Amino acid sequence: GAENSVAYSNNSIAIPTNFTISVTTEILPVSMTKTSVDCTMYICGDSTEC
Amino acid sequence: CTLKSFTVEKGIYQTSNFRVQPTESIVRFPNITNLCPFGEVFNATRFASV
Ligand SMILES: *[C@@H]1O[C@H](CO)[C@@H](O[C@@H]2O[C@H](CO)[C@@H](O)[C@H](O)[C@H]2NC(C)=O)[C@H](O)[C@H]1NC(C)=O
Ligand SMILES: *[C@@H]1O[C@H](CO)[C@@H](O)[C@H](O)[C@H]1NC(C)=O
């Protein structure tokens, strides 16, 4: 990152005089696709023997 | 039967897969009718050596 040092002192305060109102997005998943598989047809396939 | 109990409580359960049964099974082959060279292979005596 941009390496910099702060002008620290034991009698100095830095106070803002302006503000920026910013808007920030943030994206979160909440759900997966509701899948479902079937034993008797996947493993076997329309087959009585299997 | 699948839940394995005699009293099922409220809710949507899954029983099985369903599929439409096969009706009027069909078999298909080519049209040629020529018995393959069977006699030319067995009914002979001058079989070669191994
Ligand atoms: C504090 O910051 C705001 C940032 O918008 C300054 O507002 C701008 O001021 C300049 C000149 O004063 C204008 O040309 C811009 O159009 C202003 N921005 C907007 C969005 O209107 C404001 O001036 C700053 N405070 C002081 C005291 O200067
Ligand atoms: C071979 O010859 C025998 C003789 O008895 C006959 O029975 C048989 O049908 C013949 N088969 C073929 C493939 O020619």
Side-chain angles (χ1 to χ4, degrees), chain A, chain B residues 1-31 36-39 41-45 47-48 50:
Chain A
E3 202 285 347
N4 74 57
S5 196
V6 295
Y8 173 109
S9 176
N10 82 327
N11 73 7
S12 86
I13 178 64
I15 288 184
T17 51
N18 222 327
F19 53 73
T20 61
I21 278 174
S22 86
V23 305
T24 291
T25 81
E26 152 186 350
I27 278 164
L28 291 93
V30 305
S31 76
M32 271 185 318
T33 71
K34 304 182 51 183
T35 181
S36 196
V37 285
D38 313 278
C39 203
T40 302
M41 203 296 298
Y42 173 110
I43 278 154
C44 275
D46 72 78
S47 186
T48 81
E49 181 76 289
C50 165
Chain B
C1 164
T2 81
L3 201 73
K4 185 152 301 193
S5 166
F6 273 38
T7 301
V8 305
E9 71 276 60
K10 194 142 51 53
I12 177 174
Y13 304 80
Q14 203 154 330
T15 62
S16 166
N17 224 27
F18 84 110
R19 64 191 321 290
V20 185
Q21 274 314 340
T23 181
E24 152 56 11
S25 66
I26 78 164
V27 165
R28 274 291 331 281
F29 273 132
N31 204 127
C36 305
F38 264 90
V41 165
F42 323 120
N43 283 347
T45 51
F47 284 1
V50 55

